[PDB]
Amino acid sequence: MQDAITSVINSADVQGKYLDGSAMDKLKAYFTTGALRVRAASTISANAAAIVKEAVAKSLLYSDVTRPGGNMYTTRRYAACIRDLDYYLRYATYAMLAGDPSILDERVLNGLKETYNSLGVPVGSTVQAIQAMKEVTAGLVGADAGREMGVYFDYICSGLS
Amino acid sequence: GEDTVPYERYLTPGGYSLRQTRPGALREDVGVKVKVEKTARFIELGTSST
Numbered sequence: 001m002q003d004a005i006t007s008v009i010n011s012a013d014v015q016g017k018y019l020d021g022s023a024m025d026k027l028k029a030y031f032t033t034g035a036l037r038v039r040a041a042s043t044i045s046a047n048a049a050a051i052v053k054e055a056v057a058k059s060l061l062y063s064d065v066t067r068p069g070g071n072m073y074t075t076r077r078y079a080a081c082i083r084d085l086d087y088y089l090r091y092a093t094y095a096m097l098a099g100d101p102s103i104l105d106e107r108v109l110n111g112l113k114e115t116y117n118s119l120g121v122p123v124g125s126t127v128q129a130i131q132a133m134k135e136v137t138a139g140l141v142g143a144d145a146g147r148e149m150g151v152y153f154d155y156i157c158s159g160l161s
Numbered sequence: 162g163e164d165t166v167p168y169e170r171y172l173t174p175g176g177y178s179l180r181q182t183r184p185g186a187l188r189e190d191v192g193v194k195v196k197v198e199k200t201a202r203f204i205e206l207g208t209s210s211t
């Protein structure tokens with residue numbers, strides 16, 4: 001768990017060097033993008049349940065997975081699916097605020113593949129659900145904030161696949 | 162000896178003192194010593210390996 005600042009400090013410390021001009025430029029880049037990160041995080045905190053339910057309405061609804069036999073069939077499985085998608089959106093917001101995806105592979109992508117493979121959860125359908133969540137939130141917060149959200153959404157989909 | 166045009170073989174100490182000890186023509190050993198330029202030992206010890 002480290003943001004862009006802590007990773008820059010960790011690189012300069014593992015070097016043992018002081019903060020040179022490249023580290024200063026990286027921190028200036030983060031300190032310019034931080035206000036946009038803050039406003040996108042507020043806008044995403046506004047519409048958590050709406051983004052999640054629009055992602056299910058785009059991908060998972062009216063398909064086979066909500067029908068009998070699907071892994072999203074029962075009300076318990078539906079509630080756990082909404083819980084999993086809320087987790088993905090919340091941690092993508094955290095990784096957007098930090099500017100570093102270390103929290104994603106520390107706390108989402110750690111044992112997620114083995115959990116989903118033990119439960120029988122389809123990984124492709126949940127990857128499509130995360131992609132639709134990314135599409136909806138990029139329609140919500142704009143072009144560049146949607147892109148800096150979608151880089152961590154693509155990180156979650158890549159670590160899941 | 163009948164093959165070469167002359168050339169300036171000797172200077173006086175006035176003329177050599179004129180041309181060489183000018184600041185751009187100068188070296189930096191020429192008259193007093195220069196000490197060795199090592200890096201600081203606490204920087205050398207603070208690195209990440211011997």
Ligand SMILES: CCC1=C(C)/C(=C/C2=NC(=C\c3[nH]c(/C=C4\NC(=O)[C@H](C)[C@H]4CC)c(C)c3CCC(=O)O)/C(CCC(=O)O)=C2C)NC1=O
Nearest residue numbers: 065071072077080081084087107108119121122125126129
């Ligand atoms: C914060 C990081 C983190 C994540 C992401 C996480 C996921 C996680 N998802 C689970 C279940 C689940 N996850 C899903 C989700 C899906 N199945 C589908 O068909 C859809 C494609 C997809 C949703 C988009 C479902 C249906 C279950 C329930 C499985 C069951 O009850 O048999 C379980 C099983 C235990 C429990 O429900 O409470 C865990 C631990 N745990 C974590 O600590």
